[PDB]
Amino acid sequence: STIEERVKKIIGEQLGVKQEEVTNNASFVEDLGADSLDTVELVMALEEEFDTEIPDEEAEKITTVQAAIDYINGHQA
Amino acid sequence: STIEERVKKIIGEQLGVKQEEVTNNASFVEDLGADSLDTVELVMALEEEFDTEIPDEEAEKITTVQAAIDYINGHQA
Amino acid sequence: MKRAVITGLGIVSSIGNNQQEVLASLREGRSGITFSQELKDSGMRSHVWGNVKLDTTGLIDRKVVRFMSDASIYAFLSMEQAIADAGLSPEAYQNNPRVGLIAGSGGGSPRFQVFGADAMRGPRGLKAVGPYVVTKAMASGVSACLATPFKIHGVNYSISSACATSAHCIGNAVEQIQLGKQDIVFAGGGEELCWEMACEFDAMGALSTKYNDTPEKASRTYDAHRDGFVIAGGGGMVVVEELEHALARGAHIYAEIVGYGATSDGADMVAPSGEGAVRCMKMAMHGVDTPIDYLNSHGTSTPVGDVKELAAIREVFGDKSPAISATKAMTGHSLGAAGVQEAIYSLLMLEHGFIAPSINIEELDEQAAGLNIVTETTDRELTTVMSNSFGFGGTNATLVMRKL
Amino acid sequence: MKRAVITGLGIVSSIGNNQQEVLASLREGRSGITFSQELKDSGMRSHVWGNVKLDTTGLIDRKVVRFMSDASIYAFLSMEQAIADAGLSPEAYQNNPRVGLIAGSGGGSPRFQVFGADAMRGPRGLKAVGPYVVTKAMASGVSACLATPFKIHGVNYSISSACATSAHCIGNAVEQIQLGKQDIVFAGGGEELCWEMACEFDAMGALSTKYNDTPEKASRTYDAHRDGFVIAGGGGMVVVEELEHALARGAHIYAEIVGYGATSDGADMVAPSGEGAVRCMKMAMHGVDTPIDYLNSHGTSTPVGDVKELAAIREVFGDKSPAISATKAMTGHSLGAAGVQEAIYSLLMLEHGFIAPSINIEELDEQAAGLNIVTETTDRELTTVMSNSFGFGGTNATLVMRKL
């Protein structure tokens, strides 16, 4: 699976939305119903899925599906 | 501090009695006020003091001070 | 004081995943006890349990289940069943200050309390713990995890009283109806099943260990060779409703709760005194002008516990011979879920006109002589039934239920 | 029905080990918060707590304390104080079916649950667990471990409702008196303090982390730069007594419990909706014909919680808000023990005629505008006081207490 597919799978599973509402410009909070606990676990779930460590300062900027894809794409090696 | 002296130390402090009540034929339940949970904890305390394991079939036989000294003496130190 | 009735129920137990499956098991005397590789692998001496035989994957929406331990999962599924069985729709019970929820567990979540500490001590620290451990592990997890998604606006809390937990939940719900404070209270409980919780009972010497090769024979209340209880998990929920409210909507009414006893032994921490149970049964029978036809005893299959309850029953009833059976010989002991599950078994016996058997009595204990202990499924028109629950700390609860 | 009064108090808290020590701390605005090496060493971000300043080692008889976790120990010491304060001899309250006990904790014992699992997984396995973990870790430990040694024969159970736990315990005790079922009910709670429990709140982002170098400034309810609550431990107990029973024995009466609210948000799992709190306060004021002179707010020092409570207070009271203070800025948040401790602080303010200060407000939150938040100790003749408690799962409790 591509990074985009894997990000969307994680977001869908975490937020309880079908891989169909998980469009690239969707905001976790404004569009996908994420609350403050969701935002904590979503960062953890992305860190686990892609075996990366996302600093708090960078995680606070990851508020949309595309921002998560962009971050993972830019932090492979 | 022989095996006999050590066994009586553990018993007296585990059951909260003066170190003169722990006569060799004193019963934990009949004389020293132990209940069924006290006897479980007392066996554990004897295992810790003497660094030996006491099997369940042999622990059930340890209901008197003499039974404790007899087992400990009969099984090294 | 208003009258309280039961208008719906739901159950997830070792002998069935709904009331139809449970009824069939009770009529057949079917055991819910199986061998547990998990208990054996943990290093325990007891290798048997009353497990819930249900794949719960996907049964609860993500935004709800993220907060839940297994006790809450079982209680939630039981509440869904009870809502449907009561004929209630969201416009009637949601966002309604007259509708409440009282449901508990005996121990929260040992599994998730241990998970949190293990995660904290691992290499990732706080980032491994995650944000959902408190609602899984807190003692009120069962009430919190249900009141929120079912949009409950009335009372919302848990009662905990060891193995009397969900019986006190029902009694407290009845009191809310009696005081006129609520029209409906969902009452019950749940309990997870795991080595994290079970191993501490083994360490006390309270669990059966001599029948691991024959799991369905391990739980054997009143048998001369009983050797401790068999641990179980599950959930149950009943809809407690004010009588005129139920009648006005044409509800199906299982029974009226005509008696509720709650007392304390003030004596031993882990063994019943008998004296508190006598007072508890007498309290629950006060003002009830019909005889007790059937008594579901607490009957855990421990050496000490079974004889004390038998003596209390003999003191309470003397001449009279209520039919008695211990359903835990079939089900195991579901701890905080036991009170509501046994109330439900008693309601099913009342509704369907039979007495479930007290199974695995190969040699009746000498202290049980003279009592009407039923060992084969027996059809009978019942009118009034009683269920007892007792817990560590000398806590007693009794419920009496009667046809309308 | 019957009327309920408080005739005795007992408390072990971060600001004092009895009611006299607490009274002095309240008048002085003294912080109970200290730096915790334990929390820091565990890997947490929050390094501050409201610890009980007492070594309880060896205080309670070995045969009683063997069953007890710290929550039970704190509640037990509080109960001894309350019995003495109420002037109750053993003959008056022991072995008495009309005397009960309703007391809880929010989470049982995370410490001893984790101990049990750690022991089981270590080299000695089951032989390292010992026989006392169930009574230490079960949710009803606080009621079980007290009802047994105090020889309680009436009601005996725990209510749990996260941080509303011991407020619901008091309210349910009042209901037992109102129902005519008990003449005295001891009501309260306890909570242990340990990294095993605290780390799961840090993992949610709920604890203060920016003030570890100035621990007494970390808890700062209604301040614009608050950043989470400060966890605390301790216990409290009150003697709830039927009015004619108290008058007939010449008891000292602190106050009558004239209102008790218990509601549910049915909304968010960890943030209050405000709507449920409005209904809870209105329920507690029903039939109360005097104004609220002082409100002890729940006031946790979280960003989200403080604003929701301020909005609820403004909706209930409008332009006539009572004097308000949040004692948790001094004490920290003792979780299941908070409700009874805050009821006790409110009763001391009522009895001694003063309002304790809401400390550490360097800049008042915008949402508090127009409310009478008291920030300096103020002598005032009070007649009617209110105390709010809220918990996870959307659970709300309110108590209103009034002089006779």
Residue numbers in the entry:
A (entry chain D), B (entry chain C): 1 to 77
C (entry chain B), D (entry chain A): 1 to 404
Quote what the paper states about this structure.
In addition, C12AcpP–FabB crystals diffracted to 1.55 Å and C16AcpP–FabB diffracted to 2.50 Å. The C12AcpP–FabB and C16AcpP–FabB ASUs both contain the functional FabB dimer crosslinked to two AcpP molecules. Analysis of the 1.55 Å C12AcpP–FabB data demonstrates well-resolved electron density for the 4′-phosphopantetheineamide arm and the C12-acyl chain. In this structure, loops 1 and 2 are found in a catalytically competent closed conformation. Like the catalytic cysteine of FabF, Cys163 of FabB, reacts stereoselectively with the α carbon of 1a to produce the S stereoisomer. The carbonyl group of the substrate is coordinated to the oxyanion hole formed by the backbone amides of Cys163 and Phe400, and the probe’s acyl chain is positioned inside FabB’s fatty acid binding pocket. The similarity between the C12-FabB and C12AcpP–FabB indicates that the latter approximates a catalytically relevant state for the transfer of substrate from acyl-AcpP to FabB’s active site cysteine. Both steps of the KS reaction form a tetrahedral intermediate that is stabilized by the oxyanion hole, which is only organized when loop 1 and the associated Phe392 residue (Phe400 in FabF), are in the gate-closed conformation. In addition, the differences in contact areas of AcpP–FabF and AcpP–FabB interfaces are consistent with the differing orientations that the AcpPs adopt relative to their KS partners. It is also worth noting that when comparing the interfaces of these AcpP–KS complexes, AcpP’s helix I forms more extensive contacts with FabF than FabB, while FabB forms more hydrophobic interactions at region 3.
In these pathways, β-ketoacyl ACP synthases, alternatively ketosynthases (KSs), catalyze carbon–carbon formation via a precisely choreographed decarboxylative Claisen-like condensation to produce a β-ketoacyl species. The small, 4-α-helical acyl carrier protein (ACP) is used to shuttle substrates and intermediates to each catalytic domain or discrete enzyme in these pathways. Here, we use this well-characterized system to better understand ACP·KS PPIs and KS substrate discrimination by structurally characterizing E. coli elongating KSs, FabB (KASI family KS), and FabF (KASII family KS), as substrate/intermediate complexes with ACP that approximate states formed during catalysis. Specifically, we propose that the elongating KSs employ two conserved active site loops that open and close through a double drawbridge-like gating mechanism in order to regulate substrate processing.
